[PDB]
Design a protein around this nucleic acid. Sequence first.
DNA 1: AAGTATCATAGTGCAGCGCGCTGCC
DNA 2: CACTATGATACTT
DNA 3: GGCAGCGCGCTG
DNA 4: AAGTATCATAGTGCAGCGCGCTGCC
DNA 5: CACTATGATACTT
DNA 6: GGCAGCGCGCTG
Lengths: 366, 366, 553, 553
Amino acid sequence: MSSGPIFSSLVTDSSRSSRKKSDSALGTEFTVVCDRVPLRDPSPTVQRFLCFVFDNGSGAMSTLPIDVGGEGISLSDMKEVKAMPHIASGCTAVWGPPLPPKPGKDTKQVILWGGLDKRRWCCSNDLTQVDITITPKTTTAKVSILPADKQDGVPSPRTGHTLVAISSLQAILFGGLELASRHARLGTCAQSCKDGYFYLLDMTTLRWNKLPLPPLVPRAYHSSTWVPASSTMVIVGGITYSGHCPSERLSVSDVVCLKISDTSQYTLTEIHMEGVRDSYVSSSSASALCDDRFVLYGGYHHDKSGLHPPEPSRDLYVMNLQTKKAVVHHAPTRMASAGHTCLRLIDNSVVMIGGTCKSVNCCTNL
Amino acid sequence: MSSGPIFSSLVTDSSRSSRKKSDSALGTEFTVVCDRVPLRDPSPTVQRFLCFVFDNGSGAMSTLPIDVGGEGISLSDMKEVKAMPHIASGCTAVWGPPLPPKPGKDTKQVILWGGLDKRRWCCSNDLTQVDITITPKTTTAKVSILPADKQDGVPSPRTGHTLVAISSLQAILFGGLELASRHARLGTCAQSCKDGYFYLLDMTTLRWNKLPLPPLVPRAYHSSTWVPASSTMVIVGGITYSGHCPSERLSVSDVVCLKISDTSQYTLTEIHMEGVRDSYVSSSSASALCDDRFVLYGGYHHDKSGLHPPEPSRDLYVMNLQTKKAVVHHAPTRMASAGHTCLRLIDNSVVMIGGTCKSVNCCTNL
Amino acid sequence: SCMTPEECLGMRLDMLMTKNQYSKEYNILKERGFSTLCPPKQLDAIEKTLMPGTARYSLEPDSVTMDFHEYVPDFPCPNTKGVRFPYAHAVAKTLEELEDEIVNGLKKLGRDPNDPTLVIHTICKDGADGMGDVSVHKEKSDHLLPDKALRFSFCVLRCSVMHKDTEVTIYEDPNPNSVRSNRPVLECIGDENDDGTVAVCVGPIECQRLLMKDKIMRVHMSDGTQRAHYLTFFNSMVDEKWDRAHGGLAGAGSKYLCTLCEAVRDEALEKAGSYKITRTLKKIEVTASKMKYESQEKDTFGVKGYPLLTTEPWERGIDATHTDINMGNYFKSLIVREMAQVHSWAKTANVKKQIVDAESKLDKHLKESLGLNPTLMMAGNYARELFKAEHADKLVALVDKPDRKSALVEVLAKFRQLRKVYRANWPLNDMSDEVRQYKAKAVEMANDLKTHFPYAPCTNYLHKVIEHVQELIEHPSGVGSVGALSSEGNEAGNKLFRQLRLGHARKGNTYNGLRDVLCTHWLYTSKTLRDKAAXXXXXXXXXXXXXXXXXXX
Amino acid sequence: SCMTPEECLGMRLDMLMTKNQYSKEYNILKERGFSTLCPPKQLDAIEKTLMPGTARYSLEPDSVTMDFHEYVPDFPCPNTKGVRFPYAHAVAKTLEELEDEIVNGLKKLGRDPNDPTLVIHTICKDGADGMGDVSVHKEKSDHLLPDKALRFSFCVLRCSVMHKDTEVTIYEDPNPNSVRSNRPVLECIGDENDDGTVAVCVGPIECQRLLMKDKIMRVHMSDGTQRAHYLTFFNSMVDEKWDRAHGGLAGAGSKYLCTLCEAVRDEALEKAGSYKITRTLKKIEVTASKMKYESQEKDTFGVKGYPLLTTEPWERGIDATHTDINMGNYFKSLIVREMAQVHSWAKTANVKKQIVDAESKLDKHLKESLGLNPTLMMAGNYARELFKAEHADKLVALVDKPDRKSALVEVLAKFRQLRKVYRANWPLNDMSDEVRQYKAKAVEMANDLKTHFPYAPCTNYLHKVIEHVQELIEHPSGVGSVGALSSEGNEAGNKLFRQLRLGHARKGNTYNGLRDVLCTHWLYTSKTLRDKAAXXXXXXXXXXXXXXXXXXX
DNA sequence: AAGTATCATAGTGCAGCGCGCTGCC
DNA sequence: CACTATGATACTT
DNA sequence: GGCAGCGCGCTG
DNA sequence: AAGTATCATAGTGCAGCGCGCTGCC
DNA sequence: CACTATGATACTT
DNA sequence: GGCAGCGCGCTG
Ligand SMILES: [Ca+2]
Ligand SMILES: [Ca+2]
Ligand SMILES: [Zn+2]
Ligand SMILES: [Zn+2]
């Protein structure tokens, strides 16, 4: 069921939590899986999205799960487990390879890539493995930082992106660059340096094999999430390498492995849409999905100035890219207070929507 | 047993009292009676001094009893009963006439006289009756303020003194004057105005019948307490009407009703002593008694300057005025931190000594 | 070549140049050899001229504020140190100032040096207020100094009642609610909550003020000829916390809310209009000669009173400038109560979460277009943004259900329309139809709260708005306003008081330094100086309005 | 007749006269018509002369401290606003100042305009420290400003190593631990505990400092002929809270107490003397490439370190002036512990009542002869009373059992005798036998604590006294002291920083006003100005010592 | 009568963190 | 054994 | 093997 | 090139008290 | 519908 | 008939 109401979920009274009212969702990056062991409601009915809403360092407390049950949202646990050596605003990529099972608990591997530094204020390419394992009533964690020793074909460290992949050992895509200041650089860092490259990243063998294509150089700061079920993956706008030309987008760009039974024939195309107004990106993030279409937020809850168009604002854009007659409509826009920082919650063949914000800790629902 | 040790009594932890550590003994004036109904230790042994250590207004909290048991000192009660319409630093005179008894409680009448004002900063002659009654485990109070309506032969309102009397209806003596500022007075209030008069004060009939004598004018700011058992009463120094001539005292002055079977033959004499050094008064208060002699404190715990002599300091002076060979010796001086503000605790035919201070809430013991 | 010392003395004060810095500039241009400013030995001759106490009536300055002995601790002297003047000399020296103004002020009649003929009717105001958290020194003693200070000053407003049938105002001191027309009387380091001390320092000043008031005086042997005056005063700078703890009453009230009328807490009705005057003293004595807490207990009380009533003239008191803070704490509170759909003013355990969260939302939303950093202790600059003619939509923009939005803007619009009565310096010379209709207009404004809101809290200043303003301005032989009678001239003076002490005046000894605060703060506010200094003509540009364009720039 | 503008510019700064006040005095003496000071349009010509960035090396001033875009919120920009300079121009403009000093400083040799011959070896110091609770403005935005400010400045001390075999110091800047020889580099409004920002503002200044250090430069095209210099620095104004949270280590420590050695918490032994230098970075990588919290955990650590080690030269750091506060908080604590017969440093539920009561007694007794108002956050003026040669008996007068009294005075007497090593501006030119015996003397001083006291707490500054001072002064190619290398010149500068902002500089807009703080604070400290202003000759009175009498008066 | 010198002192350094115990799981 | 800041006033010039 | 309290001491 | 005018805003008003409920004696 | 305070700079003289 | 908590609102 798409086009469902707001559901401003229930806030935290800070009665058994820390002194933040759980408002520390600013600068956060995480993942979530519909998964078993209902350790937050032992009922024969409530299927539960298991989740760890904090996976960061200098953004917040170190890591933290959440009480995303079947329907409602509350608190169920407070961690500071593996207390903050971690990364800045980086990424939170696709789950790692599964491990041999145990009688009572299940295994998880999280990859973290890219980001700033809370100490040097420069680039970082912290490839990070984190082992996560869930038994009932508690969990554990292990940290596996891997610097450039195990890294083969090291990509340039850079600012910001998301990462998508087939669930084992395959391509992980399209970081976003920094005009980094170095020694003798501090004047006029408004230049434009570029790579704009494919790179297939095997998850176990740490090797960024760059896939062959004549490279479309621009537009690498935001993107969408890869879709299953006659698969596709789309990049969305937000950058012109300079911070001076806007990214008023009227088209999309499909990066997709063409014949997915093997991993071959990497091509590129663009498709113009039934454009509602203009300017797909409000220079911010949407990246979320649906089951036969996209769910793309991102607009200005507060109208920071678009450079050339006076277009962008907080509403939802939904793209019918799965249709060969690729058009753009809207769902009924639940104009809550939300905007400008959303994170996804998808499900296949059905619409089940969750989301976070900066400090308006709420739920985006459709 | 005279000449006994210090007994710095046990301090209050402010665990069940107010936020003062009972250090509010500055500017206080009270009375105390060895009396029955041991409502602070129901034992067949512990005779108990019953007491109400606060009887003031602007000095402290309104009124307050104390845990002066038989031997030791602690807390036993906290009042703010009849919360502060009361007097400033005034007096605390002899107990009033007893009332018809009740099955379970005993009656008390307190007279308060003289003092400053917390509101006008001038004289006050607040004749005050306070009804006090003690049952077990609680008490009660009533206030009877009487201004000059019921007053006959109104004396001049004035600064400071103590008051002594035979236990019913007889003479109450020797206030201490103010060089009060009025309209057109504020320059050079270092003058000298005088009364220096006897006045017999009937307790019930409010009449200050001034007893006939050719008046010794000087030395009315401090005095001692009237003594039973071949009675006598003594005045001690502290004033020269001016604040500019010191009161280095080497003699005493006996005011005593001569033939006490009636109340007649009011005479006056002075007796020089076996003077140890000089300067009986440190321009402050002693006024306490003993059973065959006096107990006279008063010296400088901090040496504020005597004007002509560099004599006065914190030790105890004990006068052998009961002996016809009237001499002055010392008890072994328990040189504690005490001085300059003492209040009395006497007993006939035995030495039992208590005392208070400014903020060093302690016990003077001999 | 060389110059006039009064020119130099006027030069120093607008700089707030400390005395050593003037000595340093004198030494620098002396060493360079320029015929320039006067030496400081030329200053301190005429510095003792303008000090008070150089006239007579109908010799050491800077008297100590204890005036009793040191060596004898019999009186319990409370912890206080400061310097005061005799009040009458401070009146007379200011009377010496405006003498030349009266010379050019007796116009269209003349007859100037006629002493028994034309008696001048002057009228003024005064008041006092405390301070907070000024630095403490070594003090070399056995008792502390409790951090705070008392100041008492007084202004001069009008000088014409007893004149002709053509009774015409001739001098108004045009600022007038400010610094540089405030002459100091009392500066001291003390404290006023566990007080004890206002009857020591401020008390005798009021006991002198009683002998001052309502008497024809003469400024005796002024300058050649004398000049008479009829002194009149108006004590209203005594804002609410000072009002009752020395006007006898009880601060929060909860039974009688006004220091002019007798009114129940729970009355949002038409009016009270009663004017209790000095009756309370008698109801002290009935409580004093009979059963202090158990006689006439809430029975005869027009108003509760504990003490015997210090400073005298209780028929006159309100402030204007120190009501905008409570009006803002009223209206922003009402907007917060409207923001979440709640009722019944409280902080209930299931309501105050909504209240605090909506207040934080209003704070962030007002931050996104205007400024509010703090939460408690509002400032008058934050007050005046909440009543400006613009920005009304921005203060209500989160409030949905637009009928309540329209009513909430409408009540504020009534408040802007009828706010011009107070904080106007001279009504009865402007807006006089509003002056003659303000009682019915304020009854309508309280009626707007009455019907569009079932809450109706009446705080201690709404009763000082919907009544006690029409008749107060209307009243004969007063002044005829509240705005120029306000109490802001002390408070900006307090901005000077730290500034003239914290690394300005004598340092190293408390009593010797506070005297030098008071001396230069008395010299700071002579009109004989400010008419001689900073009075030039700017280059005219046709009234700086228009060539024919551009109301801005 | 008319005057020199540099004379006027020197006249303004010692007054701290704001620019409008100088315009007002110019207008007053212009209207009176006196040939006097220069107009401000004559000032602001040469005001841009002394600004940095007017030389070359081996054009807009006042650069913004963000230097990236506005319209694109992709980088999470932290809450900070301020103005900085390029560091090298700030070095070079000060190098332009002392050029004429070197001209009269190259004495007994001469050979002055010989550029490849005599290369001058200069050496200096720097450091930074935060602030607290400066007022916040409207700011017209959606994020606040967290109350505080960062300042970074640097001094100049010596200019002679690479000279002759007769290697002679020729200029020392005689004050030197003060204001008016501190040139500013960074002023900004920010915060440093939830920091994020020191790597934004201070970080690139240190990354420039690395390119600065240890290189022969030339002040290129100075004035006619050039002049070369060899720049050297010494970062030690970085007092303890700054030291470890950006020197990698952990503040309270409890395992390794010094930022120079490797030492156990529980060692009151002879010495450590080890000098860890930049090794910790490698022990970051072993924690970084292997098992962040579970590899070499308290196993290989000479010292614990979380991050990858900002500002560089870690072999040099201590302060002198900011140790008297902790020495006083040590010794007054020891006197309190002695006052009641207790042991075993703690606040136990049956001991801390005795501790607090004895401390209150000591506070009142010290008040009855000297001054101590506060309790927490001691001041350096309260520090220097506790080490003066007198008043020793008054600090121990309540302590009975006179053997402990004699030992308590004796330990302090050792401390006075051996305190002259630090807070001396130039040892190795005075007290040199104390300099060559201070290690054994401090071992004796720690030995006095060792035997007369079974307590022995070793706080973070006793290890910076009983070691790390002898070898630190003894060390080759350093400076040879700690006293003139201290960090008080920033802190009195902070006294100026409120003073140049709180109602001094441009107001109404934060970023536009803090720039005008920094500009006039750069102009405040040119030696080219202070040599031209306030330099006269006082009237001599035979050295103000004696006729033949009266060491006082 | 001009000019320093002396007297005493205010100004400003203004919360995170990391132990070391503890039952307590 | 930080320096720089304040205003009388006693003691030199 | 944590683990979150006191409980406080380090330097602010 | 001299001189105001305009632009926006900081400064300072900085805890006692007295209700009105409540069980709770 | 307090006044007094700050420093560029755009717009008059 | 108190009575000392919350519990807060008044004006600071
Ligand atoms: Ca006040
Ligand atoms: Ca600091
Ligand atoms: Zn009223
Ligand atoms: Zn060390």
